[PDB]
Amino acid sequence: RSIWAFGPDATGPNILVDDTLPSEVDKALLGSVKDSIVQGFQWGTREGPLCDELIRNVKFKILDAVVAQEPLHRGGGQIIPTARRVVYSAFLMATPRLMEPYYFVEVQAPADCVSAVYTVLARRRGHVTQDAPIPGSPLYTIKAFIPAIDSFGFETDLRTHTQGQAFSLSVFHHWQIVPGDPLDKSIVIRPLEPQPAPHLAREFMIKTRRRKGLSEDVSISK
Amino acid sequence: TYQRWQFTLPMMSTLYRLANQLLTDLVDDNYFYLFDLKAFFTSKALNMAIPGGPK
């Protein structure tokens, strides 16, 4: 029953929970700042500290909210930025990760070109879920998952390697974690080479930051 | 004047069987995906060469 908000939107994938004990903090005074902590958390999840992207699948728990009795000190443009900053800092302690959108590809192809479909998929971090015959038809359906970023030209690769005999339609399915760790300065990235999976997240994070125009790296702090 | 021909299906089938050695035996135009007239027009307009295509 402690839920305050539900992510950046009314149905955002994040939750805000107050664990403030009734003895430790007076709940009536906490209600004065609930309506502002909710807004600060919503805005913070809307922006995100890493690369100005949405935050997903994160539960935020408030442990202690010391509130000034004087209403002239709290409320408005003083408590909202504090809430956003504390959201950012709390997010940054627990190991941050990036998330790729994953595409769901269905491919129809004859029996012989199924292996070629497998070969095309294997090059783009693709993971085949199932192949199965189409009842009453001489074709097969291959259903697989492919990262959205490793999908540009996948349709063309599949239709060219198979001489046009295989056709694929891709649609967004879910969000999955990039293999690497975004906050790791040990990794050195060259400008124009594909990166190994162990540090894809670092590239995805710094290049997105450069594209957005922010600083070159985050400042992990309190 | 020999300017029009009307044939029966049993004759067209025989003519089709006899000429199979000169026939591609394809049933679709998907084989020519990105290898057809429009693709070559685009490559010429974009000053690019499709591998195996005209330059």
UniProtKB/Swiss-Prot annotation, chain A:
It is linked to Mandibulofacial dysostosis with microcephaly: A rare syndrome characterized by progressive microcephaly, midface and malar hypoplasia, micrognathia, microtia, dysplastic ears, preauricular skin tags, significant developmental delay, and speech delay. Many patients have major sequelae, including choanal atresia that results in respiratory difficulties, conductive hearing loss, and cleft palate. It is found in: Nucleus. Required for pre-mRNA splicing as component of the spliceosome, including pre-catalytic, catalytic and post-catalytic spliceosomal complexes. Component of the U5 snRNP and the U4/U6-U5 tri-snRNP complex, a building block of the spliceosome. As a component of the minor spliceosome, involved in the splicing of U12-type introns in pre-mRNAs. Component of the U5 snRNP and the U4/U6-U5 tri-snRNP complex, a building block of the spliceosome. The U4/U6-U5 tri-snRNP complex is composed of the U4, U6 and U5 snRNAs and at least PRPF3, PRPF4, PRPF6, PRPF8, PRPF31, SNRNP200, TXNL4A, SNRNP40, DDX23, CD2BP2, PPIH, SNU13, EFTUD2, SART1 and USP39. Component of the pre-catalytic, catalytic and post-catalytic spliceosome complexes. Component of the minor spliceosome, which splices U12-type introns. Within this complex, interacts with CRIPT. Interacts with ERBB4 and PRPF8. Interacts with PIH1D1. Transmembrane segments: none annotated. It comes from Homo sapiens (Human). Belongs to the TRAFAC class translation factor GTPase superfamily. Classic translation factor GTPase family. EF-G/EF-2 subfamily. This is 116 kDa U5 small nuclear ribonucleoprotein component.
From Swiss-Prot, chain B:
Widely expressed. It is found in: Nucleus; Nucleus speckle. It is linked to Retinitis pigmentosa 13: A retinal dystrophy belonging to the group of pigmentary retinopathies. Retinitis pigmentosa is characterized by retinal pigment deposits visible on fundus examination and primary loss of rod photoreceptor cells followed by secondary loss of cone photoreceptors. Patients typically have night vision blindness and loss of midperipheral visual field. As their condition progresses, they lose their far peripheral visual field and eventually central vision as well. The MPN (JAB/Mov34) domain mediates interaction with TSSC4 and SNRNP200. Has structural similarity with deubiquitinating enzymes, but lacks the residues that would bind the catalytic metal ion. Part of the U5 snRNP complex. Component of the U4/U6-U5 tri-snRNP complex composed of the U4, U6 and U5 snRNAs and at least PRPF3, PRPF4, PRPF6, PRPF8, PRPF31, SNRNP200, TXNL4A, SNRNP40, DDX23, CD2BP2, PPIH, SNU13, EFTUD2, SART1 and USP39. Component of the U5.U4atac/U6atac snRNP complexes in U12-dependent spliceosomes. Within the minor spliceosome, which acts on U12-type introns, interacts with PPIL2 and RBM48. Core component of U2-type precatalytic, catalytic and postcatalytic spliceosomal complexes. Found in a mRNA splicing-dependent exon junction complex (EJC) with SRRM1. Plays a role in pre-mRNA splicing as core component of precatalytic, catalytic and postcatalytic spliceosomal complexes, both of the predominant U2-type spliceosome and the minor U12-type spliceosome. Functions as a scaffold that mediates the ordered assembly of spliceosomal proteins and snRNAs. Required for the assembly of the U4/U6-U5 tri-snRNP complex, a building block of the spliceosome. Functions as a scaffold that positions spliceosomal U2, U5 and U6 snRNAs at splice sites on pre-mRNA substrates, so that splicing can occur. Interacts with both the 5' and the 3' splice site. This is Pre-mRNA-processing-splicing factor 8. It comes from Homo sapiens. The lineage of its organism: Eukaryota, Metazoa, Chordata, Craniata, Vertebrata. The chain holds residues 224 to 278 of 2335 of the full protein.
